[PDB]
Design a protein around this nucleic acid. Structure first.
Lengths: 56, 319, 152, 51, 228, 123, 50, 50
RNA sequence: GCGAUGAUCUACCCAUGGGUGGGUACAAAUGGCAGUCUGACAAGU
């Protein structure tokens, strides 16, 4: 969810695509100020399943 | 925010009746009503219904009043009649009926309101109407008590003055200042004071040709000159008298005047000269009634002045 | 003297070297300026905790009663037995008087101009107290408060 | 919106096409629309399915 | 093909194309909030319906000192269903902010969605007459609009303007004569409410009868000096 | 008694309503039941709306005042559904009803007087 | 727009008169009265349909 | 009944297509505009142009 | 330093720069067409 993101997650995204581009900082700031309404847990898990599906 | 009870009064055919007054009787849980059919109705509040229905007199009741015990209720009509309705006697309160006990007329023109007070000190109801007088009557013995008729005119706040110099008189009503010289009697002037909109509360002229009018909002000053059978007037000006309030006005001479203002502030001018005063302590009644500790009367000698305030308090001022 | 004020940035109390005459003098002097901010800078600010839920319940139980950070501040606000305080609500004034400090505080009197002026000047207390633009914080907080007032 | 609508609509809500064709040429209206597959109708039989 | 033109106030535009219409410049483009139409020319735009937004009728009726500006902070009492508040957000733009207020619910949720789409919105979902539950969240509005049918229009404006309207501030109110009196002439009611505000520290600068658009409403505009 | 319907009449205004609706249905210028009132409101023929504040649950007509607010049509509640039924002239409880438009009625004056009353209350 | 609205009112009238005819057909104890300006109308006897 | 359905459907067509046409169309504002003045001299010297 | 393994051949402006017009394949949308059935009897005895 848009909350459980720390600077450890920042470095994790750096291990992922890129933090040198600053996108990790961008998303962490936007999540800190995040305005999208937070939603049901079960929606987070099934949508994660969906993301795994599209990735595979 | 709900209306949950509705009753209708018996109707008149050639007209559109209207219930002029209502009132609540708390001893026995009723409400009483006086209605332009010329009727007095006693409704019991619970169950919202009718116990008593009297045709009181010809025309529309206007006011109702009660004693504390709800043993006497007095109706004040427009056809000049006061009715006393009774319940004090034992079987009467035991069955909660009422009685058209007495009626009586004393007013001259007609009645507009009635309000009753009772206490060990005194026990009276007060009727006030169109004939510019108030009548005070005995609540306990209305069929027996003797009235009192306190009359129209009360000169406590005078609205006229006279100047023996050139032997004339000046009267004022709402923005109207009529003067007459005597010799027969002939009018002189007329001052609809176009500017102000209140009743003129204090106007005065000295020995001579000066004049002042005063209202607690603004005040104004004039000089008169005799042009013969008529006079002419001119509107003198001072911002101080324009701005300051005036309870009371007096003349020292034809140039010096003194002014008492509702904040109990006194000024002197020679045509901002202020003079001190002595304070007053406050009691419980002084807290309650605000105006009693305000200056009540101002008088002046050739020089000296005297001030009287509601505590019976009297003081001397040397300008 | 002291004045309380409640912000999405936290909880700010300002010292006022004495009130009512102060209210007059300030308004006829038109003290809506940062110069007046220096004249009365601050007594003690308390930053909140960055728990949106904590701030939500803070607002809820402020519209109700006194809140946790508020007692954790009033425990230390006092310097003497009685220290005059300026509040913006009748109900919170009564609650503060009825809690366990038992010091002097005047209610939401004619000091609307003063609360208004400190509200206007706290943008200049952003460099002093809240070193950031709290408009976004107010945005998120208001969103959350509306959602929670509704069942949502 | 869905509660905003009245009953007859929620009956007819699917086959709006045939509904409008019938309306604009004076044939007789359809009856089921989308609520066909409701299990209740799924055990009903004919005119009974309509009712 | 379509012609844009600016109005006496900033942000208001008229399109002269095959038609002439009232329009604002979307920060959020291509997302028509309440089924209103739109137009592009490139950049985006969003139309007003005066028949649905009282303030729009005033714009067409002509008002000189309508203090709502792009770079401005504006409070919005009677924000219901989000339409006109979305419009005023769009006209103040990103730098401007609109402090919307509602106390019904269903328009509350609609406004919640509208805030969910726009940042310049800031919704308040509280009592009209109890301005504390938002004193603690609102600060230094410079311009206030109110369209409310609670006949204490003068109160609610006086309160929230003393608490919020910075000095020499701008105030504008919509009045429904049929709501407050419905027996005596709307001219009389308008005048009466005028001296009402006059006593309540509004200098009344102007009022528009919303005649050919809505029945029996007046928009009153004034300023707010040496007040608090 | 239900805290959900906001405008609820008294005995007097209830009497006035139920009379006007008797003569309306006696002419058959009245449409009955919540669904049909909903239809009419969307038709824009609904002169105005009576509801029954004693239907369990109340939501099943609570929805309509949404439409009423939108289309600027008067709506009132009366507190007895069996009353509204035996008034409008059927054999069942009738939670709602709406009076239609026809200028050729012999009841225009009554219908506007009543809708004046309901406007007075609602506003 | 003008002919929209006038066609609209014309169709409203047509529909109103035609539903009057339907009601004429349905059921009850009707009564035909010639109202003073010379216009027909129908009134139903006071009767609760079962 | 089928004739009623047909007519009412046409009436709905025309009605809401009217409302669309209006919503895109625009009227002209004819409303009163009374100006506030704090002095009778300014009243007399008033000119909307200035 | 040619070719049957294939030569040649299938809208308007501002002088190999920009602006206009049309024609096919793909996507977009709260564009359109385009409008949400009727309204008291029925079944058993």
């Amino acid at each position: 969810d848009k909350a459980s993101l720390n600077d450890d997650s920042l470095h994790d995204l750096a291990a992922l695509l890129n933090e040198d581009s600053g996108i990790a900082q961008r998303v962490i700031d936007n999540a800190r100020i995040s305005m999208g309404q937070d939603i049901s847990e079960t929606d987070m898990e099934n949508v994660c399943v969906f993301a795994q599906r599209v990735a595979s | 925010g709900r209306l949950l009870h509705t009753m209708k009064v018996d109707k008149a055919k050639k007209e559109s009746t209207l219930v002029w007054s209502v009132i609540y009787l708390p001893r026995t849980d009723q409400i009483a009503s006086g209605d332009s059919t010329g009727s007095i109705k006693f409704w019991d509040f619970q169950f919202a219904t009718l116990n008593q229905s009297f045709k009181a007199h010809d025309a529309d009741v206007l006011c109702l009043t009660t004693d504390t015990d709800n043993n006497y209720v007095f109706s004040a009509g427009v056809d000049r009649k006061i009715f006393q309705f009774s319940q004090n006697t034992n079987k009467s309160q035991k069955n909660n009926r009422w009685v058209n006990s007495s009626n009586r007329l004393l007013h001259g023109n007609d009645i507009r309101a009635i309000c009753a007070y009772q206490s060990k000190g005194a026990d009276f109801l007060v009727s006030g109407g169109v004939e510019k007088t108030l009548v005070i009557n005995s609540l306990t013995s209305f069929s027996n008590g003797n009235y009192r008729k306190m009359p129209t005119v009360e000169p406590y706040s005078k609205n006229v003055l006279v100047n023996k110099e050139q032997r004339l008189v000046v009267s004022w009503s709402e923005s109207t200042v009529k003067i007459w010289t005597m010799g027969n009697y002939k009018l002189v002037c007329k001052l609809t004071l176009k500017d102000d909109q209140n009743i003129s509360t204090c106007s005065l002229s000295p020995d001579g040709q000066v004049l002042v009018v005063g209202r607690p909002s603004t005040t104004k000053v004039f000089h008169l000159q005799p042009v013969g059978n008529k006079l002419k007037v001119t509107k003198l000006d001072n911002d101080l008298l324009l701005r300051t309030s005036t309870k009371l006005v007096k003349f020292i001479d034809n140039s010096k005047i003194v002014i008492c203002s509702c904040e109990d502030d006194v000024f002197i001018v020679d045509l901002p000269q202020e003079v001190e005063l002595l304070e007053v302590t406050s009691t419980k009644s002084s807290i309650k009634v605000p105006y009693i500790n305000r200056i009540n009367h101002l008088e002046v000698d050739q020089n000296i002045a005297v001030i009287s305030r509601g505590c019976g308090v009297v003081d001397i001022l040397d300008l | 003297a002291y004045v309380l004020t409640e912000t999405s940035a936290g909880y700010a109390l300002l010292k006022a070297s004495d009130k009512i005459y102060k209210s007059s003098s300030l308004i006829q002097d038109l003290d809506s300026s940062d110069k007046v901010l220096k004249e009365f800078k601050i007594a003690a600010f308390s930053k909140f905790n960055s728990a949106a839920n904590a701030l939500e319940e803070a607002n809820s139980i402020i519209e109700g009663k006194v809140s946790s950070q508020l007692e954790k501040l009033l425990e230390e606000i006092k310097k003497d037995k009685k220290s005059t305080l300026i509040v913006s609500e009748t109900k919170l004034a009564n609650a503060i008087n009825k809690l366990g400090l038992n010091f002097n505080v005047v209610s939401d009197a004619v000091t609307l101009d003063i609360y208004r002026a400190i509200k206007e000047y706290l943008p200049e207390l952003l460099p002093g107290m809240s070193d950031n633009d709290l408009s976004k914080m107010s945005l998120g907080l208001a969103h959350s408060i509306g959602r929670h007032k509704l069942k949502f | 919106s869905l509660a905003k609508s009245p009953a007859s609509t929620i009956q007819i809500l699917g086959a709006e096409k045939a509904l409008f064709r019938a309306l604009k040429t004076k044939h007789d209206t359809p009856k089921y629309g989308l609520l066909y597959h409701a299990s209740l109708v799924g055990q009903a039989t004919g005119k009974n399915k309509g009712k | 093909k379509v012609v844009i033109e600016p109005h006496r106030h900033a942000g208001v535009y008229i399109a002269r194309g095959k038609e002439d219409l009232l329009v604002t410049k979307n920060m959020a483009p291509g997302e028509s909030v309440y089924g209103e139409k739109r137009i592009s020319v490139k950049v985006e735009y969003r139309v007003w319906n005066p028949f649905r937004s009282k303030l729009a009728a005033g714009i067409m009726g002509g008002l000189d000192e309508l203090f709502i500006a792009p770079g401005k902070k504006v409070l919005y009492l009677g924000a219901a269903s989000g339409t006109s508040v979305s419009h005023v957000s769009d006209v103040v733009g990103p730098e401007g902010v609109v402090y919307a207020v509602e106390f019904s619910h269903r328009p509350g949720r609609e406004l919640i969605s509208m805030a969910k789409k726009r940042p310049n919105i800031i919704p308040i979902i509280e009592d009209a007459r109890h301005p504390q539950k938002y004193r603690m969240l609102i600060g230094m509005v410079d311009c206030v609009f109110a369209d409310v049918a609670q006949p204490d229009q003068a109160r609610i404006i006086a309160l929230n303007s003393h608490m919020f309207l910075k000095d020499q501030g701008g105030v504008v109110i919509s009045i429904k004569a049929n709501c407050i009196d419905s027996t005596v002439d709307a001219e009389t009611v308008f005048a009466r409410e005028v001296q009402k505000l006059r006593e309540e520290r509004i200098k009344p600068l102007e009022q528009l009868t919303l005649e050919p658009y809505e029945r029996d409403h007046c928009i009153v505009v004034g300023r707010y000096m040496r007040s608090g | 008694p239900n805290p959900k319907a906001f405008p609820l009449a008294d005995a007097a205004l209830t009497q006035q309503i139920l009379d006007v609706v008797q003569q309306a249905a006696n002419l058959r210028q009245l449409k009955k039941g919540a669904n049909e009132a909903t239809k009419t409101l969307n038709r824009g023929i609904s002169e105005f709306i009576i509801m029954a504040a004693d239907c369990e649950p109340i939501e099943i007509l609570l929805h309509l005042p949404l439409l009423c607010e939108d289309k600027n049509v008067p709506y009132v509640f009366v507190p007895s559904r069996v009353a509204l039924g035996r008034a409008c002239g059927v054999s069942r409880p009738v939670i709602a009803a709406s009076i239609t438009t026809n200028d050729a009625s012999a009841i225009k004056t009554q219908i506007y007087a009543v809708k004046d009353k309901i406007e007075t209350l609602l506003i | 727009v003008k002919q929209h609205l006038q066609r609209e009112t014309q169709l409203k009238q047509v529909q109103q008169r035609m539903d009057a005819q339907r009601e004429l057909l349905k059921k009850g104890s009707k009564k035909k009265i010639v109202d003073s300006s010379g216009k027909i109308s129908f009134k139903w006897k006071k009767q609760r349909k079962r | 009944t089928q004739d009623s359905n047909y007519v009412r459907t046409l009436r709905q067509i025309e009605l809401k297509k009217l409302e669309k046409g209006a919503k895109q169309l625009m009227f002209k504002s004819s409303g009163n505009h009374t100006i506030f003045v704090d002095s009778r001299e300014k009243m007399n010297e008033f000119t909307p142009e200035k």
